[PDB]
Design a protein around this nucleic acid. Structure first.
Ligand SMILES: [Cl-]
Ligand SMILES: [Cl-]
Ligand SMILES: [Cl-]
Ligand SMILES: [Cl-]
Ligand SMILES: [Cl-]
Ligand SMILES: [Cl-]
Ligand SMILES: [Cl-]
Ligand SMILES: [Mg+2]
Ligand SMILES: [Mg+2]
Ligand SMILES: [Mg+2]
Ligand SMILES: [Mg+2]
Ligand SMILES: [Mg+2]
Ligand SMILES: [Mg+2]
Ligand SMILES: [Mg+2]
Ligand SMILES: [Mg+2]
Ligand SMILES: [Mg+2]
Ligand SMILES: [Mg+2]
Ligand SMILES: [Mg+2]
Ligand SMILES: [Mg+2]
Ligand code: NA
Ligand code: NA
Ligand code: NA
Ligand code: NA
Ligand code: NA
Ligand code: NA
Ligand code: NA
Ligand code: NA
Ligand code: NA
Ligand code: NA
Ligand code: NA
Ligand code: NA
Ligand code: NA
Ligand code: NA
Ligand code: NA
Ligand SMILES: [Sr+2]
Ligand SMILES: [Sr+2]
Ligand SMILES: [Sr+2]
Ligand SMILES: [Sr+2]
Ligand SMILES: [Sr+2]
Ligand SMILES: [Sr+2]
Ligand SMILES: [Sr+2]
Ligand SMILES: [Sr+2]
Ligand SMILES: [Sr+2]
Ligand SMILES: [Sr+2]
Ligand SMILES: [Sr+2]
Ligand SMILES: [Sr+2]
Ligand SMILES: [Sr+2]
Lengths: 49, 142, 150, 142
RNA sequence: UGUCCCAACGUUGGGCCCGGUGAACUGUACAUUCCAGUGCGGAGUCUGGAGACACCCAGGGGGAAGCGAAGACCCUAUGGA
RNA sequence: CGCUCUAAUUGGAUGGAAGUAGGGGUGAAAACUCCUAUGGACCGAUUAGUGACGAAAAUCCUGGCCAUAGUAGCAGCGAUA
RNA sequence: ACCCUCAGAAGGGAGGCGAAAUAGAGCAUGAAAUCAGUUGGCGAUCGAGCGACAGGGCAUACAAGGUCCCUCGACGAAUGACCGACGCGCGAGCGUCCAGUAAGACUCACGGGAAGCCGAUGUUCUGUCGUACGUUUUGAAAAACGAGCCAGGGAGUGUGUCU
């Protein structure tokens, strides 16, 4: 759930801004966002044997 | 009273005629810079080479003036490729034992930068006695 | 903060510095530029004349909208930055003071080196229309001065 | 005011364009040329159509400006400028070592360049630079 | 009856110059342009000419198909309400 | 070719490691390497592996910063001080 | 610490400590963007994808590169003469012989020379070519879309099954 604990939403078109989820004026959740989730991180379910 | 470099500083390797010829060719022909397209137009774009991939790229399309594109045809002569300009083949050395098996007539030695002064002194005096030139010699005031 | 950016022979030189002064950085470049090479005493008289309004300071770089001044030589735009001038008078006061304490003829020394450097901004915020606020800052300026025997 | 010309060309009864072409050629080869008797230079064709063309050039213009010369002096020099890359260093240099004159300010007579001569006994459809200038409204100072 | 013929003079606050304070919009790059042409047919940047010494102040806004808003019109989506 | 960490084999470092800056050499190239200054404690090579492994771009994200600019505003309200 | 300066517990100067204060308080290192001062090159008559490749100017402590230039001679691929003689053409000019000769890129040897001198690096000038990049597109310099600049961040991953 790292990076997913936020209700951040995108404003969409209109304010001359990239459609990126934001909360309190901060971009969040998405992989390109600082403090966002890891896109393809190490996973516990992976069989390493 | 003046700085002097240790070792066989002026030593030259002995090359077959064909090798001296090819070494001379490489040096005369040279090659283009081969820097990345438009690296000069944007600071965030470094000089390190990257194949131009734009569908419309002028360099990719091979337009005269946009610089040469890396191709095998630019390779240097096999017989000389990699040689130090002096003609010597270089051998990376980290200690005195690395000097073993090195032919001073054909190879010159390059002491890794990490190596300290104490160990460099030993390596430098052992290479000279072995008739091996050291490309990056220590300068002492003699 | 800065460090003197030029070498100085202690035996024939005297130094001084201003720190984090809240004054126009742009005015400081203009003033430094104008007094360099002058004598401490000449610089002082010059700056007093600027504050008095009898001598304009050439504004050669930060000159947009600035009106021409007949007394400006070789250039057109100039002004009378009294605030930054007074700060430079404190610098010269300190400099010449140090110079004399060392046995030199303070006022007589040449301003060998003098340069202003922007060390930062004291940040401020100003409420604007439409529920937004924008920057309203103060420049922070360091300035170095090296006096040297003729 | 004194012009050490290596060559003094006499444009009298000579086809302007043909002289201009040779003076440009020589100027580019480093020669300093003085064209004399410009008002007497000549241009073949119907006087009425020739003048219309030069009148159109006088009328063209705007704020940016299209300053076209009216004196035979300048007409000829502009003609030469059109055969020189006057905006290039070498071209401006050549052009600047060329001068045209009304009458002959020299004591030495000019020479008639081969192939540029017009024979009045065999031609009737031609005009004179002086005539053109007068029509254009120039002040016949020559 | 200054809405108009047809505009004038005046008043107060700005505007302009000086001290202090001191933002924002906008910025691929280059950029002194003009006339024609060409080009995905609506070019400061391509071609040909023309013009062009650098910098600065004030101005009214012709152009940058100016800036501001992933066109609201129209159609399309095995979209929504 | 380059990056991380693991293992085996094997090396470098306070007689100055990594990093950074400027500079020399090699390689078609990814990139490798040396010199000098700074720095003041760690750093490789080969082989077999491991992978949150390579950016110029997404009106991409966050931080920092320049031009804009000593520019707009600090006048306008029946309360001109 | 002490002293000097100052309206001054500010700041500055000098000084003391320590291997180091360019370790003096968001105080290990200290990139880029970018700012001040300054060095080299260019610069107030001249033109715009900012360069690539050639070639000139000017600039250069050492180290890590050491070459380069001129006479002559040797070798000498494709190519390839002048002149002279003879013979044709109205003419421009051509043919035959001289002759596949002289010449001919590179490379080398002898003799002489250069050390800012050769390379290289900075900048500038000349020549040739040249209207970014990525994307959308039949067609992009585009008056189609994206970005102010830099640094860092930023996209084929796991389980199961199948082939
Ligand atoms: Cl290969
Ligand atoms: Cl500022
Ligand atoms: Cl005109
Ligand atoms: Cl030209
Ligand atoms: Cl006739
Ligand atoms: Cl060869
Ligand atoms: Cl993939
Ligand atoms: Mg995270
Ligand atoms: Mg770049
Ligand atoms: Mg103004
Ligand atoms: Mg409100
Ligand atoms: Mg839309
Ligand atoms: Mg509708
Ligand atoms: Mg519905
Ligand atoms: Mg091994
Ligand atoms: Mg990265
Ligand atoms: Mg890309
Ligand atoms: Mg403005
Ligand atoms: Mg620090
Ligand atoms: Na939360
Ligand atoms: Na597992
Ligand atoms: Na200026
Ligand atoms: Na003046
Ligand atoms: Na004046
Ligand atoms: Na004619
Ligand atoms: Na005209
Ligand atoms: Na009225
Ligand atoms: Na306008
Ligand atoms: Na944006
Ligand atoms: Na050069
Ligand atoms: Na697109
Ligand atoms: Na494009
Ligand atoms: Na277009
Ligand atoms: Na901004
Ligand atoms: Sr909309
Ligand atoms: Sr080292
Ligand atoms: Sr300015
Ligand atoms: Sr000719
Ligand atoms: Sr043009
Ligand atoms: Sr206006
Ligand atoms: Sr990644
Ligand atoms: Sr700013
Ligand atoms: Sr008031
Ligand atoms: Sr108001
Ligand atoms: Sr001290
Ligand atoms: Sr031969
Ligand atoms: Sr970045």
């Amino acid at each position: 759930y790292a990076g997913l604990r936020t209700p951040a939403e995108s404003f969409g078109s209109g304010r001359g801004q990239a459609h990126v989820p934001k909360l309190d004026g901060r971009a969040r959740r998405v992989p390109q966002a600082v403090k966002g989730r890891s896109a393809h991180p190490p996973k516990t379910e992976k069989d390493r044997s | 009273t003046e700085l002097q470099a240790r070792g066989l500083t002026e030593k030259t390797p002995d090359l077959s005629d064909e090798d001296a010829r090819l070494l001379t060719q490489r040096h005369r022909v040279g090659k283009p810079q081969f820097n990345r397209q438009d690296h000069h137009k944007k600071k965030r774009v470094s000089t390190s080479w990257r194949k131009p991939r734009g569908q419309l790229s002028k360099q990719r399309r091979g337009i005269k003036g946009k610089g040469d594109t890396v191709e095998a045809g630019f390779r240097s002569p096999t017989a000389v490729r990699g040689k130090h300009p002096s003609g010597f083949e270089e051998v990376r050395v980290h200690n005195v034992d690395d000097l073993e098996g090195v032919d001073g007539d054909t190879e010159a030695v390059r002491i890794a930068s990490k190596v300290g002064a104490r160990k460099r002194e030993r390596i430098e005096e052992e290479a000279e006695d072995a008739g091996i030139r050291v490309l990056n010699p220590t300068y002492v005031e003699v | 903060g800065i460090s003197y950016s030029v070498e100085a022979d202690p035996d024939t030189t005297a130094k001084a510095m201003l720190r984090e002064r809240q004054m126009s950085f742009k005015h400081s470049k203009a003033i430094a530029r104008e007094i360099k090479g002058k004598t401490a005493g000449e610089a002082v008289d010059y700056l007093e004349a600027v504050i008095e309004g009898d001598q304009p300071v050439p504004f050669k770089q930060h000159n947009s909208g600035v009106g021409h001044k007949s007394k400006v030589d070789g250039w057109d735009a100039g002004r009378y930055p009294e605030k930054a001038s007074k700060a430079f008078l404190d610098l010269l006061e300190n400099a010449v003071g140090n110079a004399d304490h060392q046995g030199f003829d303070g006022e007589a020394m040449t301003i060998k080196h003098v340069a202003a450097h922007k060390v930062g901004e004291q940040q401020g915020r100003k409420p604007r229309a439409m529920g937004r606020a924008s920057a309203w800052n103060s420049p922070q300026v360091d300035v170095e001065l090296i006096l040297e025997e003729p | 005011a004194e012009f050490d010309a290596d060559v003094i060309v006499d444009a009298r009864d000579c086809i302007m364009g043909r002289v201009a072409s040779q003076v440009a050629e020589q100027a580019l080869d480093g020669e300093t040329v003085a064209v004399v008797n410009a008002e007497r230079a000549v241009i073949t064709g119907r006087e009425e159509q020739i003048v219309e063309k030069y009148e159109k050039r006088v009328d063209i213009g705007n704020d940016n400006g299209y300053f076209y010369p009216k004196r035979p002096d300048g007409i000829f020099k502009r003609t030469i400028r059109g055969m020189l890359p006057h905006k290039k260093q070498r071209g401006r240099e050549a052009f600047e070592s060329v001068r045209v004159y009304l009458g002959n300010p020299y004591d030495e007579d000019g020479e008639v360049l081969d192939g540029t001569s017009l024979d009045r006994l065999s031609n009737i459809k031609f005009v004179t630079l002086g005539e053109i200038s007068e029509t254009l409204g120039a002040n016949k100072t020559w």
